[PDB]
Amino acid sequence: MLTPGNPKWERTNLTYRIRNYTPQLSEAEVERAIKDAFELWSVASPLIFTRISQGEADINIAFYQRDHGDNSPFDGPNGILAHAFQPGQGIGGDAHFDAEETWTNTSANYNLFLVAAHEFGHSLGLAHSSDPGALMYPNYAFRETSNYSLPQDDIDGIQAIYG
Numbered sequence: 001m002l003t004p005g006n007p008k009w010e011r012t013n014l015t016y017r018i019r020n021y022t023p024q025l026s027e028a029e030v031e032r033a034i035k036d037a038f039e040l041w042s043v044a045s046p047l048i049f050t051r052i053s054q055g056e057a058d059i060n061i062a063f064y065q066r067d068h069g070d071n072s073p074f075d076g077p078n079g080i081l082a083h084a085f086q087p088g089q090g091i092g093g094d095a096h097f098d099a100e101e102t103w104t105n106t107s108a109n110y111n112l113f114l115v116a117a118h119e120f121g122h123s124l125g126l127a128h129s130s131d132p133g134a135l136m137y138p139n140y141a142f143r144e145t146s147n148y149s150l151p152q153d154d155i156d157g158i159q160a161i162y163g
């Protein structure tokens with residue numbers, strides 16, 4: 001499902017920056033979750049993601065609580081977990097995570113890798129899917145992560161935008 005107006009990135013080598021972290025995972029564990037979330041999309045498209053440690057990146061990633069400057073506030077534990085902006089300059093592409101969640105790398109609610117993988121779909125121009133097996137389904141569901149691969153519906157979706 002592709003977003004109304006089909007916003008898409010014009011370049012396929014995009015940068016990202018992790019602006020801050022969550023105390024419930026090590027910094028390394030957050031960096032891995034994020035790296036692997038991008039790689040899912042990279043191996044199904046021509047997109048190549050490059051991390052930068054400082055300065056201005058295409059996709060900023062941050063953990064924030066409640067009001068955090070973009071007029072879409074987070075809501076405390078549970079409920080909304082994260083959100084992401086469609087491709088564009090500035091805030092476009094960026095992905096925010098609710099700092100008040102329990103973030104994990106386990107089956108326990110909420111696996112950061114899974115949530116980030118979903119948000120980056122939005123960052124790249126995908127909408128929600130109605131397929132309950134799709135990563136882009138609106139509601140979180142745990143799936144095994146140790147050798148995770150994009151569900152077929154999400155491959156279909158990114159290929160429709162980027163080939």
Ligand SMILES: [Ca+2]
Pocket residue numbers: 057058059060088089090091092093094
């Ligand atoms: Ca951006």
Ligand SMILES: [Ca+2]
Pocket residue numbers: 074075076077078079080081098100101
């Ligand atoms: Ca929340």
Ligand SMILES: [Zn+2]
Pocket residue numbers: 068070072083096
């Ligand atoms: Zn936000």
Ligand SMILES: [Zn+2]
Pocket residue numbers: 118119122128136137138
């Ligand atoms: Zn979503």
